[PDB]
């Protein structure tokens, strides 16, 4: 009867919805589709309150809450949208991820290729916020499953078969970056001050 | 009013009161003075 | 009793979108010492230039 | 100028204090007298005023 929403916007527009973040280096059809049909996509995705955010420079995608410009409703609220709110481990993981990404793009430019960066080098890194809970093997344990958790929000590839590990570009866009870099900072002031 | 140091003279002649502010690395100081103290302040100037 | 029976999909619930400005960080209490310290700060004397 | 200057007080709220504390540059606590007749405000560029 009534006309169908082409094949591949709808599959882009789920694939989307269901991981959050598209990317060219890795879903070059749909990213290129999304691209050219902007409209398209963004009027499908207004009803919802939803909206896509490009950032041609990285290459990359990701659903951002659409609500009006600084409404009485100073921090949206959203039905879907469900906050989250990391535990500490995973706030100082992602502060180094950050900080390791930001430097990299300082040297290399931004949105250059992103240095993979072997698991070796976060332990000692984790070890000076967090100490040494035991063992090696409870170490890197901990270290593989909160890069697995990370994953889940697209931060990082999954380890390699060498035991290395990429950057997700979508780290750029996390919610308040000034967080992260105070927190740390903060941590790693005490850490000496108590010594 | 506020003036970074412009028309003074007018100020003078139209408020009673003044504060000034300095600067001084990444604190920054306040006083409330009237116009006849900051007067007499200048004339401890004028030995100069 | 651990198959799957072809029943269909109904009330199919959307929610979780991963938004990436969804996420907030770790809040970390710090007990250190409170500050007392109201000095009236007297010393605003002037120190300006001609 | 005075005689204008009765409906100040007379009338009217008129601004008089203002408190600080930590706010901006002004580490501790401060405070700036205005009279009821008019207050200006000076200082070298970048200082507090604004
Ligand atoms: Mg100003």
């Given at each position: 009867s009534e006309t169908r929403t082409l094949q591949k916007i709808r599959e882009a527009t789920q694939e989307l919805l269901k991981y959050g973040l598209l990317e060219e280096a890795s879903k070059p059809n749909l990213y290129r589709i999304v691209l050219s049909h902007p409209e398209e996509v963004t009027r499908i995705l207004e009803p919802l309150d939803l909206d896509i955010g490009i950032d041609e420079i990285r290459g990359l995608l990701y659903v951002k809450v659409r609500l009006d410009?600084?409404?009485?409703?100073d921090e949206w609220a959203h039905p879907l949208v469900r906050r989250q709110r990391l535990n500490l481990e995973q706030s100082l993981l992602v502060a180094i991820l950050r900080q390791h990404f930001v430097a990299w793009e300082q040297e290399s430019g931004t949105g250059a290729s992103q240095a993979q960066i072997a698991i070796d080098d976060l332990l000692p890194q984790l070890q000076i916020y967090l100490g040494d809970p035991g063992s090696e093997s409870k170490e890197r344990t901990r270290l593989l499953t909160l890069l697995d958790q990370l994953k889940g929000h697209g931060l990082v590839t999954s380890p390699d078969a060498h035991e290395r590990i990429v950057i997700r570009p979508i780290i750029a866009h996390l919610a308040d970056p000034i967080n992260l870099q105070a927190l740390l900072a903060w941590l790693r002031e005490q850490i000496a001050q108590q010594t | 009013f506020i003036t970074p140091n412009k028309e003074m003279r007018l100020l003078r002649d139209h408020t009673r009161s003044a504060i000034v502010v300095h600067r001084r690395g990444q604190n920054s100081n306040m006083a409330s003075l009237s116009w006849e103290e900051l007067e007499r302040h200048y004339q401890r100037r004028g030995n100069a | 009793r651990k198959q799957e029976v072809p029943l269909p999909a109904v009330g199919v619930a959307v929610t979780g979108?991963?938004?990436?400005?969804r996420l907030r960080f770790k809040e970390v209490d710090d007990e250190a010492e409170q500050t007392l310290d109201l000095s009236?700060?007297?010393?605003?004397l002037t120190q300006i230039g001609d | 100028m005075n005689q204008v200057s009765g409906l100040a007080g007379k009338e009217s709220f008129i601004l008089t204090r203002i408190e600080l504390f930590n706010w901006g540059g002004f580490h501790g606590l401060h405070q700036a007298a205005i009279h009821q007749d008019g207050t200006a405000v000076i200082g070298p560029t970048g200082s507090g005023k604004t």
């Open positions: 410009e600084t409404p009485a409703q | - | 979108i991963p938004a990436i400005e009236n700060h007297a010393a605003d | -």
